[PDB]
Design a protein around this ligand. Sequence first.
Ligand code: CHL
Ligand code: CHL
Ligand code: CLA
Ligand code: CLA
Ligand code: CLA
Ligand code: CLA
Ligand code: CLA
Ligand SMILES: CC(/C=C/C=C(C)/C=C/[C@@]12O[C@]1(C)C[C@@H](O)CC2(C)C)=C\C=C\C=C(C)\C=C\C=C(C)\C=C\[C@@]12O[C@]1(C)C[C@@H](O)CC2(C)C
Lengths: 213, 227, 67, 150, 227, 40
Amino acid sequence: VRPVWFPGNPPPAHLDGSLAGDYGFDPLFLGQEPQTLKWYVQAELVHGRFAMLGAAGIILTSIGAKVGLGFPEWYDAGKVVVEKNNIDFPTLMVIQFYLMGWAETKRWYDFKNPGSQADGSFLGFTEEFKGLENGYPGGRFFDPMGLSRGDAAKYQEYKQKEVKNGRLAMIACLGFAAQYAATGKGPLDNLADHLADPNHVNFATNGVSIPIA
Amino acid sequence: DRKLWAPGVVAPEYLKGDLAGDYGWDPLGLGADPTALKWYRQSELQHARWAMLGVAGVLVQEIVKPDVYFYEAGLPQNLPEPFTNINMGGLLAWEFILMHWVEVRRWQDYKNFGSVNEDPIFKGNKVPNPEMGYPGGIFDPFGFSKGNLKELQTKEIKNGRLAMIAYMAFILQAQATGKGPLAALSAHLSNPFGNNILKNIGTCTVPHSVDVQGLTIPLTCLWPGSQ
Amino acid sequence: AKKVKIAVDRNPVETSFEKWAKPGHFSRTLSKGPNTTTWIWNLHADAHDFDSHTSDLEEISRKVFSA
Amino acid sequence: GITSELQLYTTAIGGLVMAAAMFFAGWFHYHKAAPKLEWFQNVESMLNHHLGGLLGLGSLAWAGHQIHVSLPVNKLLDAGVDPKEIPLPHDLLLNRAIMADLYPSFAKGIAPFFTLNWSEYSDFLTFKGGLNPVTGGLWLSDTAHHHVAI
Amino acid sequence: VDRSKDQLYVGASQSSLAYLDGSLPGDFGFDPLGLLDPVNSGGFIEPKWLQYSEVIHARWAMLGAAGCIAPEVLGAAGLIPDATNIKWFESGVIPPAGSYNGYWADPYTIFFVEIVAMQFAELRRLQDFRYPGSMGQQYFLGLEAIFKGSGDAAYPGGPFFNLFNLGKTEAAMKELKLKEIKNGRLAMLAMLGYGAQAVMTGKGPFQNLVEHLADPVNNNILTNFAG
Amino acid sequence: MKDFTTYLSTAPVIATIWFTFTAGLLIEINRYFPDPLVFS
Ligand code: CHL
Ligand code: CHL
Ligand code: CLA
Ligand code: CLA
Ligand code: CLA
Ligand code: CLA
Ligand code: CLA
Ligand SMILES: CC(/C=C/C=C(C)/C=C/[C@@]12O[C@]1(C)C[C@@H](O)CC2(C)C)=C\C=C\C=C(C)\C=C\C=C(C)\C=C\[C@@]12O[C@]1(C)C[C@@H](O)CC2(C)C
């Protein structure tokens, strides 16, 4: 019925299409156990959401570099920001783990005991941390515009859109790393080269990806 | 009982002669989905009608102005004296604004048939629009729609399909030989054997790129011909 | 005059990790699990003694061929 | 005839592919298509294939490597040629002219083999015996005639 | 293997007649190794896969046999430029033997497009063998209408693969399948002839034919052992 | 997957992982603090 990653192959039993972005792709049966599948569903969303922020940030700053606004490449921004602004790297790293540790520990114990973070313990907030589904916090803090509290049909459509752009972003972030390692240039520097001579400038001719070439 | 594209070939079930110029030809089976068939039918009309204007323009333009070489007519310096070296950016602005309005109106008709018949500004004006893709009314001032409309639709699509094939012949011939349609026809008559596709097919006469008022525009041939 | 020919059986066994989690499955004696430490040594000693797991020559030959 | 670490590296990669093939075969012939008992009991057929097919063709195939790769490479190595300047094994295979210089018998192609003028190949199919004085090991030309006879 | 036509070929044996009953195309009883015996079959050695594989080998070989000699014949007749009059093994498939510079891309760039294109063509073809009719169900841009198969993997039929629905009658279809198999088997031997002749002589298939006709006695396999 | 994780919980598999971890920790400590003889 519903489309699958490999046309003609029946989907796995444990993937019934209820989840967003379900194409029955689980060749290694990593999520056969129902409780483990909940953990990975949220792991995919967190991975996808971070990748979308990463890809958008890398793309935008790369446009700034090409246009000449002075932005550094994503693989040099860390060094430039610290030196130019005179920031102690170990202090910045520690601050990150306090803020991430607090925010991400709360997400951890909401997964273990759903609704536990909405008991008013944290500064008296009792409804912004209740959670709607697994991986979808909802609420008037994480969803201020209430797009998850309006139409039910369109909210399900967005869940499909979120996961697929997340998976695409995850692949893109792997492309940025692989392209930098093979080429040593920025993302849009590679795109400009390909558009110049697509036939003679690509991975099959970089001298790295296909060593036998 | 109608004749089909090939002898002794069974027509698809969904092609039963309802549409004009129906030979039961669909090897890829792209018309299986009824909703998709409607959309593809509209695009056939758009290509058919635009192509016929394209063929007529090239041929008539060649007769009136032999030297313009329509393939290069797009360059601003080759425009007529009143419009010579006009700013292409402003020229494109007119087309985008005007075509966006016209085409969205046509598109909205497809999405919701009969919704956009009436004039938006002057209330009262309307077009009959008997069938999708055939607005009629003000679009048919001479009233040829009256009468055997089915036959006229057949004539339109058959000529339109021929124009589509004919125009892409102009493009490939210009790319390979560097001459317009009529000019290439004269060349073949002069030396039918020495000058034909067997010799010209291996060369592409289109430069890699052109500079239009400081903006570089990539160009290509439709095959990897020997530049 | 039995002809020389290729002869196989289709899908004789199922590929599952179920028996990987049940030590001693191959032998009737050890399948019940351990009660003394002697069971552990018996598991490794008789693992490849195919001829004693089953009395079927065909089953023995197939294990030898894949081993 | 191995002269570079690239040649060693490729064999290792081929070794892993063979290792994967061997484990697939074991799984395939137990869980998917297991031979029946009557198949295992064709001792006459097994000996025929293992005598002429395993040992026989294996010896012939290795003779092909020695005649075309080991003998030319080791002839130049013993002469003192720098290993990096020796022709690659495929150049020796594709260019009969190079082989003719080392062994003139190659100038006649395979006609002597089919015309039974086997004495033409005396230059690389030898029966010297003893040890090669330069390297202290058996003549490879003797070893090639050994595996051709075997 | 008896050449030409006959009820049975040289290698036909009473053992092979047990299961070879003429149902398959080109069933001349030739199976000395008895690989098509249904009894206790499995894996890839079974009638359905072996018969399917022969047809697939036949069709690739037919394209290869005609494509490995056409450049030489057309080049010899002057219909293509001499720059493309290239031996089949010097096109670039085996760079050590010879490579052609002048393709629109590096031969490895072209290969990647070949990988992606053949992944779709071959894996979709496979899925129809594993799950008959399964490729006509999931959306594929409306093209699934022509991928419904016909129950027999080697003969999909349908609106595209049977564009002109030849062999409408059962008797006619059997003759066409027989003609396909015999031409396919002949082409498979021809391709093996090209490979063996290339190594022995180092020249193209067309050159070998011309030389043989010149002096048939002085040009043949026996004389090519030495040069 | 339940059975596979059960197989990884068998005594030989646990010991291999546990000693591989334990050995790695000791090896790494001696890599960054070479030649420890006295607490100091
Ligand atoms: C039916 C429409 C139409 C056709 C068939 C042509 C055909 C041609 N024009 Mg002409 N033009 C057309 C409309 C127009 N032209 C021009 C202005 C020019 C100029 C200035 C030039 C041409 C030239 C050319 C040639 C281009 C060769 C090529 O590979 O280009 C295709 C190359 C591309 C890079 C584009 C290919 C894709 C596609 C056609 C464009 C799609 C763009 C999207 C809408 C962008 C969307 C962006 C997203 C982010 C929203 C060819 C003879 C050139 C010429 O004469 O060369 C000798 C030339 O210099 N044309 C204008 C502005 C008034 C047009 C307006 O409609
Ligand atoms: C016995 C001690 C004790 C321990 C070990 C913990 C441990 C924890 N509590 Mg805590 N609690 C403890 C006692 C108590 N807690 C609470 C009430 C709570 C609540 C309500 C919550 C926790 C949470 C947490 C976790 C925070 C994880 C993290 O990364 O924080 C990172 C730590 C910080 C961001 C704060 C500390 C930062 C830094 C060390 C001090 C900086 C001070 C400066 C003034 C900063 C100024 C900067 C400005 C100017 C820019 C963690 C497991 C949170 C959690 O994860 O719940 C699931 C949570 O929500 N605890 C109470 C009151 C009843 C306690 C009473 O004894
Ligand atoms: C299987 C068909 C085939 C293939 C794969 C190639 C491949 C190639 N040809 Mg060749 N060619 C062919 C057939 C083919 N040719 C035929 C039949 C002719 C006679 C018309 C030519 C005439 C020809 C010329 C004059 C040149 C090439 C060249 C080339 C190169 C590409 C660049 C180019 O300009 O091509 C252009 C070639 C074509 C567009 C031919 C397309 C043929 C299609 C694929 C097959 C169907 C044709 C059909 C029967 C109609 C024929 C004409 C019609 C009027 C009867 C490349 C090596 C160029 C070269 O040598 O570069 C160094 C070059 O200059 N070819
Ligand atoms: C992942 C694939 C897979 C799976 C799930 C199964 C599943 C099964 N197999 Mg099959 N099998 C496979 C692959 C697989 N097999 C392969 C690749 C082969 C070819 C060798 C075989 C050959 C085979 C045979 C011949 C038999 C089975 C049997 C079984 C059953 C029990 C197996 C068991 O208890 O293993 C648990 C065992 C282990 C984890 C030991 C692993 C041993 C391998 C070879 C590694 C050896 C490492 C070596 C000792 C290293 C040196 C050690 C030193 C450093 C200390 C079960 C249905 C048995 C059966 O059906 O009995 C009724 C049976 O007789 N299998
Ligand atoms: C198994 C061992 C073996 C092998 C593989 C070879 C191989 C070779 N020997 Mg050697 N040789 C051997 C043993 C071997 N030899 C032994 C034991 C002796 C001692 C008697 C010799 C003595 C000897 C001499 C004296 C010579 C060779 C030569 C050769 C080369 C050419 C032979 C020839 O003319 O073939 C003729 C034709 C064939 C072998 C048939 C080829 C069939 C092809 C592969 C079919 C491909 C079909 C396929 C469908 C097409 C591709 C399609 C695809 C791309 C789509 C060749 C590399 C000659 C040479 O060039 O030396 C440098 C040479 O002069 N050999
Ligand atoms: C000890 C080795 C061995 C033996 C005795 C067998 C025996 C058998 N296998 Mg198994 N198999 C083996 C290894 C072995 N296999 C390995 C290593 C693999 C993994 C690659 C497989 C994969 C495999 C499959 C997938 C299948 C079998 C099948 C079979 C059966 C028929 C075999 C046949 O007729 O082949 C005749 C051989 C051919 C038709 C192919 C010849 C060409 C091959 C591909 C390459 C041979 C290379 C050659 C030895 C060296 C060339 C040198 C040089 C020119 C490069 C039979 C029970 C079939 C079965 O179950 O049938 C009921 C079956 O479907 N085997
Ligand atoms: C298995 C089949 C096969 C394969 C793999 C090859 C492979 C090759 N052939 Mg051979 N060939 C074959 C069969 C094959 N041939 C057959 C059967 C014939 C006889 C008809 C020929 C005749 C032939 C000739 C005459 C020549 C080759 C050449 C070549 C080489 C270049 C290919 C090339 O440039 O294609 C070009 C690519 C295409 C034709 C495909 C175009 C793909 C685009 C995307 C299609 C776009 C379509 C468009 C949008 C709509 C339709 C337009 C149309 C109506 C005008 C290459 C080694 C050439 C060579 O050796 O050069 C050195 C050469 O000159 N072949
Ligand atoms: C619109 C068009 C051309 C338009 C041209 C225009 C406006 C030209 C304008 C100008 O030139 C002038 C006048 C003067 C110049 O100075 C400037 C320009 C601007 C250049 C052509 C379409 C041309 C369209 C073509 C050729 C389409 C062909 C489609 C075919 C054959 C499809 C076949 C099948 O799809 C079916 C139907 C069913 C399936 O089952 C099977 C298959 C086989 C897939």
